[PDB]
Amino acid sequence: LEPPTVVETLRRGSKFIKWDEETSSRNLVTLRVDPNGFFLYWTGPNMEVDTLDISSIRDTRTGRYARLPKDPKIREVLGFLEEKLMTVVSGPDPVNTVFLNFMAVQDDTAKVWSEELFKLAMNILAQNASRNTFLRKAYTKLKLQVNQDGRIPVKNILKMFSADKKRVETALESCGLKFNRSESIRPDEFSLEIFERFLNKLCLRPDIDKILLEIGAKGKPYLTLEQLMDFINQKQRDPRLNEVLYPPLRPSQARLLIEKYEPNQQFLERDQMSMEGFSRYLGGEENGILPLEALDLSTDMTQPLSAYFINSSHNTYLTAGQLAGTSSVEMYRQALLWGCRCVELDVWKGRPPEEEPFITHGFTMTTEVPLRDVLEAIAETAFKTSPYPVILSFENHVDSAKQQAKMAEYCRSIFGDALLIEPLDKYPLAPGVPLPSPQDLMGRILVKNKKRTDEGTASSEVNATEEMSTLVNYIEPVKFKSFEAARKRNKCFEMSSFVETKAMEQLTKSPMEFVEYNKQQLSRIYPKGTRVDSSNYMPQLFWNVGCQLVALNFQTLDVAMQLNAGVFEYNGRSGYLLKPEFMRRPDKSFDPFTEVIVDGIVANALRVKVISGQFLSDRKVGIYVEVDMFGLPVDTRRKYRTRTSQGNSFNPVWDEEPFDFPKVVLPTLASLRIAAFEEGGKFVGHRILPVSAIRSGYHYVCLRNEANQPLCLPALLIYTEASDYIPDDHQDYAEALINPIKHVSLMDQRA
Amino acid sequence: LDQLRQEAEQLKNQIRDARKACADATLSQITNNIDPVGRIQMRTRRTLRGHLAKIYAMHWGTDSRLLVSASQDGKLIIWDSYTTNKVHAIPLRSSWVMTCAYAPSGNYVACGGLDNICSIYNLVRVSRELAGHTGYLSCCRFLDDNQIVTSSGDTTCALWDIETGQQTTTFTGHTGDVMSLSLAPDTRLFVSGACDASAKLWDVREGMCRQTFTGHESDINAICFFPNGNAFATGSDDATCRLFDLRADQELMTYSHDNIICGITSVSFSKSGRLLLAGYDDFNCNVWDALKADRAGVLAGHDNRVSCLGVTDDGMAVATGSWDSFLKIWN
Amino acid sequence: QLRQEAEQLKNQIRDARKACADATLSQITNNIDPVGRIQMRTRRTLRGHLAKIYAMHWGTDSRLLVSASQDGKLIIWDSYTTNKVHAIPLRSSWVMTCAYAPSGNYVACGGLDNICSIYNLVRVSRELAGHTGYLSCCRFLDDNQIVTSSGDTTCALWDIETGQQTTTFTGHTGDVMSLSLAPDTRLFVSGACDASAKLWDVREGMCRQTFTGHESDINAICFFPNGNAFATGSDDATCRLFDLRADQELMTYSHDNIICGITSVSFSKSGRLLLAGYDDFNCNVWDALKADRAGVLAGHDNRVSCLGVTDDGMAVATGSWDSFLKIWN
Amino acid sequence: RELKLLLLGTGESGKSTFIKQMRIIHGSGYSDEDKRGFTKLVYQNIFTAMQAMIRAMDTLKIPYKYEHNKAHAQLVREVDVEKVSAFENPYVDAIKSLWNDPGIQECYDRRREYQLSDSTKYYLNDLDRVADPAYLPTQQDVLRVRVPTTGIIEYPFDLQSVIFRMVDVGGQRSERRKWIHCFENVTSIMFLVALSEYDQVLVESDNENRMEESKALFRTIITYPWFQNSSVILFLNKKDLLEEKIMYSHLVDYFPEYDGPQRDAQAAREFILKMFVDLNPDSDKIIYSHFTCATDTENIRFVFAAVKDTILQLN
Amino acid sequence: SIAQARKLVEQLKMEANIDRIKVSKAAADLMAYCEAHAKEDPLL
Amino acid sequence: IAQARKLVEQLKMEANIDRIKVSKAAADLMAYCEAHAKEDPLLTPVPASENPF
Ligand SMILES: Nc1nc2c(ncn2[C@@H]2O[C@H](COP(=O)(O)OP(=O)(O)O)[C@@H](O)[C@H]2O)c(=O)[nH]1
Ligand code: ALF
Ligand SMILES: [Ca+2]
Ligand SMILES: [Mg+2]
């Protein structure tokens, strides 16, 4: 994690011939990035600037990977080198992305611009930024987007806070600016101390005016050093942590918060923080809902491959329904650059005039993609965002002897070095020795294929030859027999892939044994062939028994894919999560369908109270907030949901009881989901937090859309109380352990 | 240092003996034969809406007609209690505004805030610019068109000059920040209440204190006078009021009620001297009897905090300007 | 040691400019009755361009002109009868300049193809190829010498009879946006992306002086028709008027209703004006001495990207990114 | 059978080090690839143990012998402790120039007035050999690292006739709400009292003596009716540190009821056992006590042999 | 620091020569002011 | 290296510049514009006889 710095060739910009294919309009623009790393802006064809949001860039490819022009009028006007092209592909979902074809004019300022802009699109301190940063993004979007005369149009400010255009047309008249629906503000006269004041006359806040009556700021305007330091040590302080690992704040330490957040100099001169210095602090860089050591690549990455929730996909190539959609190669690049580590490939037998294998769902008339471009998509983009091993779940339907050699030479020449041909010398393919780690395979691409009708076409694939099976070393599928005849075989490299409605008869019949299978071997689970509209099963139903390769259709982002793209955002967007300790120790055994707390697993007790919201909707509607928790089946039985919005627009305030999830049995598996809607069912935003890392006290949740990219303006304000669990038989005999001296001083006094 | 503490502190033991020597009667021993007021209800009239953020003070006029309503967004609006019309809507370069006033001649209006300046206006533009404090300003009142007494957060009450723009007298003697003051109806003296749980009686023609009062356990959040000028009452922060008597120099009564935890924000008497209103940070505006220590009615329409209060000169209206920008007027 | 020697010598110039700043021009121009306001009505408008016009250069006899657009057309207009006298389809669609010869028979046009083309008045005569960046201007001296200015911080003094550089005027740190010549054609000046006008010679070949004072690029430069001063125009909505003698700026043409950049400035026939064409689509006519505005030539629906006043000084002509050259008189 | 043993006791009492001892004695010991994972923790331990002296210095209001050696304080004062991976050239000559300072050596004797780990007289005396680039940590460098335990970790050890499940728990005041999830099916409670903590105050509470908290915590553990059918083995850790210490710090200053001899480590070691085995409400129950030392492996061997020999014959 | 102690000593010197009127002669007059204004009470 | 010597050898050529005062240069600009204002067809308006447009 680093702050997103902007290189000095990026700021002050370069000169790009920005072309297109639809309109086929070629233009010479100059590209700048603003000095915080927020927007990529360039002047238009009619002298108004445009702003690509950098935080919504999927990829920035260049060189021989970039989008070549097709129109012979535009191949001639660009000068056709091919090492200058730069394609900045952005978009909100992987299914409907929007390209942006540039072309450099100097010698190789495109390999620089396409790398120092991809490091700002994949920055874990920009996507997880504070709330006072997402209000300097909605301010840079107003300073940048000027009209022809070099001045912010007032028809743009009303088009930002577009719920009440009478509270926006009156806040502008109180700060002194022009407030006509056609007029224009000069950008020197819209400084950040004016936009901060303009947001204060807009949004009346009685949520943050109580947070100050509760901590004892009853009278005078200053909140002292002592009250603030008792606030950050007692309310905002996670009560599951050591008091020696993370020590509480000392007065030497809660005084660089005053010198960072205080605007006044007669208050900061002593040690007294004003109220505006407090409301600057609640959305500060410190007071975030998740700590910075929960998002960087910090898990133990050396345990065997059988002990990791690997991310997955099922029929990755389709962009639509499973029956008559359109299959494209781009859903290999957009899946893997999201944190996917198990793609599917349905390699089918090619035609007589050119024997070349292609990819389609079998016998359903979907369009076809060839294998040589699919493998060049997988090889290009695999280790761009996470250096951890990609598994290619082949489905060999090719019954031609002359084409298995073609698909072997394709795998051996396109991947080349990064294909795990030969087994590692440390972990041989012997009965008993386990699978490697993600660190013994950092940068290896492992094929998955056989060696020597709820499923659809997956149930009948051909027997492999000696030319394709020789790349299958560790991950190898084999026909399932039972569990007892797979635990006396004791081979920790073989696997067997389940369909969903036949793993639902092994998840319920024997879930004691189906964890202990997955402590040693792998398992892949793909949705059944009745879901012909590209819908998903819930993966946390199948992650309770520790199944790793849970395959999900990356097309339709329903609730299952808002989960599978929100819990694999942790571990540094690496696509590898670590199983909890009781599902990867071969001695400890436990039931996933349990109803009590497990002996050795510390429980927790969550209490989320949703207080208010900021700028949630773009129209005057009512807004409700759903709060769910996913986990073991004894944690998911609570799905709370607030009443609809009762406060004014730009700031709904809910008066709801705190939602108590009192007994989380395994809190290193459970994950909380806060999804704010509109009345009628429209999505607005959601955030998926884990329970084992979410802090306590009055925090800002900065909401995200359905693919977990940050929404700029919307946010909630919740109050969480994540403490430990103490059972009902002795909740006072865990008070005799915290303060034992006074407990015995009471016991001898009561004699 | 401690060689003079033997004399300076035995006077603090003498000053309790002198005040306990005269306290032979209380209000419950004289006003037991005083008939009660019953219940006093009031109905909301003419909610002067129009502010964009929190109202922080108000002050009436002498002819019971106009009232300044300072806001937290830089807007001194001079409302009319009859017609609900913004007679002026004077903007400010200052955002944080914590005080306002209105001259007895009606042609001047003051201001203040965290920016240390008491900007007296003219009646539209800034007439004089009053700098000279070193902390945040809290309450400013007018003696006349040529003198203003301000009370800052740098432990200073200050009697100024309007035309030139310099302090003609500075009163120190407090320890903590001075939260409010209130002039006397004779205007030969005034009083002031501060963050060190003290309230001192000054003198405007001399320049120094002459009586100091204690009894509260936290800040004095605001303060006001009995209408004749021979007793004065305060708010507090531990949800209690008082009534000190300047002819006896000792506290007389305390307006504490059970199930009242949220503290005072402003206190203002009536024109008959009989109802002590009080603001509260539990969103209400409760009314006490001044002579029997018992409540007499709730004035509850607001939902955010109540920041200020005041009857007019004739005692007709009660303008309770809350924190939710709606300045209700009761009768 | 050399940085101390550079920053010590860079302070001898500031006190020297302070000693020669004895009585500024704004003070001594207080005894002149101003021009007031000049009103120019659009007399001709030339259509025939299909895309954004990037440059122009008025002829020497003040009658014809030549313009260049991104659709690969260099058209020569007659500014009396509005007739396309010639139209040259180019070998590259990207131009950034054009020029017209003082003899009146050659036309130069270089662009992003890094190569200055020279046409005869048809077919291209020479092809001046040695540059490592995009060409950003060119102005003829006569039928043999042409002072280009690329975007690799250089200039040139090409000899078109053999196509090789007589001199090369290295010395900037960024792109030489646009030059200008002199009335005697013995000196010239140049701009930059370094906020730094420079001045050179055409025989000695050395950067003779250096002027600074801006805050962003220099996008265009003119010359005083006496030959003793010039004036730039920047990307930060500020024209100046530097001098050759005092080596310091003399005025500054900027007032704060105007924020967007400048694209071409040009003086009048007597030099008592300064026509500057902004990016708010208008071409304000500053008074060259009092530095107050004296008109607005608001006629264009897109960004104005060229100007130029005739050799006689009769009528000015501008041309914008909506393909129309309008001749304001 | 499989038997479950709890390791209960307060913080910085050396419970993990007892787990490392059982990993050396009765398990897979530290091989060559296993010690090299500790070479960052010794450097971070030296940095934290040196910064704690620097802050206490400014808090103990004293001056450094040399201002040239005072200039070496800020170079170690600004190190990000968690981001330390190498022990390079300018950092050796800071902490190797601050330790021969007579002022800091005078500060070191007043370590009862602040927080400093009890393994800084073994790391800042091998420091001429830790600064070598060809560093492999010895096993006693491994048994003295300071890695503060959070949560609750389990540990099984095959003793060739039974299998003991040591439960390594946390030790602070914020780690005693997690012990509740290991009280089911206990067999014995190995309490770990640090003998040489009678004159230091707690980390989270700077007023209460650390020997009273263990004396208090131990009163509570054996008075549960939950641990009524489970044997209690008391271990008196750090028995050496209370042999080099008793010579300058007396037990009559911190526990006034001490009626034994002065400057005798064995008398205070005998008195702690009287102060603990007389914390029994029932006269019938007995507490099996051993005076251990969690870094001396030959001390832990016979002690744990006796503990296995009494736990299996109690069951 | 001695000047502040000297001013704090000299401030309470003028708090001693002040004649005080009894509370029986003060609360009675405060009640006589409030019984004599039952005709100018707009809030009752 | 070569930049460090060519910059100081160019700035050493910025010494011997014989400059004429701003009050004289401004007077010469005013002597130029107010002597050639007769010829300019943009300061004074032109008659429509000689105007070709
Ligand atoms: N000298 C000495 N040090 C010890 C002994 N036992 C433990 N320590 C040290 O005390 C320090 C703290 O022990 P620690 O592992 O942190 O216990 P925990 O925090 O409760 O898990 C360790 O570095 C041990 O080396 C002992 O018998 N003698
Ligand atoms: F104090 Al510990 F493990 F008990 F760090
Ligand atoms: Ca398939
Ligand atoms: Mg431990």
Author numbering:
A (entry chain Q): 13 to 92, 99 to 470, 575 to 873
B (entry chain C): 4 to 126, 133 to 340
C (entry chain B): 6 to 126, 133 to 340
D (entry chain A): 38 to 352
E (entry chain D): 8 to 51
F (entry chain G): 9 to 61
Sentences from the paper on this structure:
We also determined the structure of the PLCβ3·Gβγ(2)·Gαq complex bound to lipid vesicles to 3.4 Å resolution. The structure contains the PLCβ3 catalytic core and proximal CTD, two Gβγ molecules, and one Gαq molecule. The CTD linker and distal CTD were disordered, as in the other structures of PLCβ3·G protein complexes on membranes. The structure is very similar to the structures of PLCβ3 in complex with each G protein on its own, with no additional conformational changes observed. Each of the PLCβ3·G protein interfaces is unaltered by the presence of the additional G protein. These observations are consistent with the functional experiments, which show that binding of one G protein does not influence the other, and that they act independently to give a product rule for catalytic enhancement when both G proteins are present. Six reconstructions with at least 4 Å resolution were observed with differing tilt angles of the catalytic core with respect to the membrane, ranging from 34° in the most tilted to 13° in the least tilted.
pmcPhospholipase Cβ (PLCβ) enzymes cleave phosphatidylinositol 4,5-bisphosphate (PIP2) in the plasma membrane to produce inositol triphosphate (IP3) and diacylglycerol (DAG), (1, 2). Basal activity of PLCβs is maintained at very low levels in cells via two autoinhibitory elements, the X-Y linker, which occupies the active site, and the Hα2’ in the proximal c-terminal domain (CTD), whose mechanism of autoinhibition is not well understood. Finally, we show that nonlipidated Gαq and Gβγ regulate PLCβ function independently, the former through kcat and the latter through membrane recruitment.
